[PDB]
Amino acid sequence: DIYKAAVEQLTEEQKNEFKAAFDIFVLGAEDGSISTKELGKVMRMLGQNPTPEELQEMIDEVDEDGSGTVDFDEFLVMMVRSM
């Protein structure tokens, strides 16, 4: 619940910005959630080269429903975790 705090401190504008980013990363996604596939595309689009294992790691750190995918709520937590 340490990160749950920082997400509640985010303004509606900040959340709307992340939603716009989230919305573009899920294009193609079957269920409308970031899967390792989508995450890998965003990262590579940003010049990174992650492995399947590293991608599953990033997702697992915020996968609170155990879906193996990131939904917008878990995504806001991913951003806040950065720092």
Ligand X SMILES: CN1CCN(CCCN2c3ccccc3Sc3ccc(C(F)(F)F)cc32)CC1
The SS3 assignment for 82 reads coil
Count CB-CB contacts under 10 A for residue 25: 19
Among 17, 60, 65, 73, binds Ca ion (CB under 5 A): 65
Output 11 or 29, the one with its CB closest to Ca ion: 29
**Residues placed in the known binding site for Ca(2+):** 63, 65, 67, 69, 74
Kindly state the number of chain residues that form the binding site for a second copy, as judged by CB under 8 A: 10
- Contact (CB, 8 A) for 25 and 41: yes
Q: Which of 22, 27, 28 shows the shortest CA–CA distance to 71?
A: 22
82 belongs to the binding site for ligand X (CB under 6 A): yes
Kindly state the number of chain residues that form the binding site for ligand X, as judged by CB under 6 A: 15
